[PDB]
Amino acid sequence: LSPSRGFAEHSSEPPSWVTEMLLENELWG
Amino acid sequence: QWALEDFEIGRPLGKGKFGNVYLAREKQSKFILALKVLFKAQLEKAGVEHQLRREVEIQSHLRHPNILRLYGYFHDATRVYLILEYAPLGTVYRELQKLSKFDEQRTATYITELANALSYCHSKRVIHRDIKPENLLLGSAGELKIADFGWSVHAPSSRRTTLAGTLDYLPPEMIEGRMHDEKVDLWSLGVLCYEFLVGKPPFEANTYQETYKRISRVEFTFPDFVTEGARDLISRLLKHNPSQRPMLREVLEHPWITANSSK
């Protein structure tokens, strides 16, 4: 097992809860 | 190399983000298994190939009675296939749906099995980070098995900063995108113990924003029927400071656990 390399976080789909929080922010603040 | 032609295929067992999981049988041995299918086009669009890579390299390494086995993998033009141990009694999620709440014996037994599995994981410096009821499967004797390692990491030397997992089960350091370690699984264990006894996770709110705030401020309360021993264990696991959460050995030896677990 190798130590897990990181990744480019903003180049891919975030967990769904992040997407939902962003929607709530955009929809009603 | 495995290929699809090595398998008989049966009914879908469950639905995943990138494809279904199917009942399957290896043709020569007639051994019953599960085939987890991921569509390449969807994986590529989502850009989460690293999660699949981690899932395979980490889970194929693990050998424990309470951790779902990954036997192998293969792919064709459009799909990736993971060959998994079949868990006949389904998810803990479904079991909680049907029973609403678990009694203390069932809960303590599950927590024991989870703590054993996590103890093994953490000894190999693996952090699961997503141990919610739909990723907890049940073997033929109803024993709990941890599955779905797509959010897992091998972190032997350094802490992690990835935004991962599922909000209701995440500790303050993970939702805030701060550095985190194996102690995140201990927080999730507390969430599970509460959800098992009460029927809902402790920070549930109608909005994601509110749930986020409740987690960050450790805002939860106990229903009257949760006993003193259970309150003690849960309160120790749901500490804002990760270093104040107990070792898994302390969970396994907790008086409420030993008094109630059948394992």
Ligand SMILES: Nc1ncnc2c1ncn2[C@@H]1O[C@H](COP(=O)(O)OP(=O)(O)O)[C@@H](O)[C@H]1O
């Ligand atoms: N080995 C298995 N045996 C029985 N059911 C399974 C198995 N693996 C997955 N499932 C079912 O399929 C669902 C999705 O599988 P999972 O590996 O968690 O996919 P995802 O990574 O997309 O969440 C599970 O919640 C469960 O209902």
Ligand SMILES: [Mg+2]
């Ligand atoms: Mg899953």
Ligand SMILES: [Mg+2]
């Ligand atoms: Mg997954």
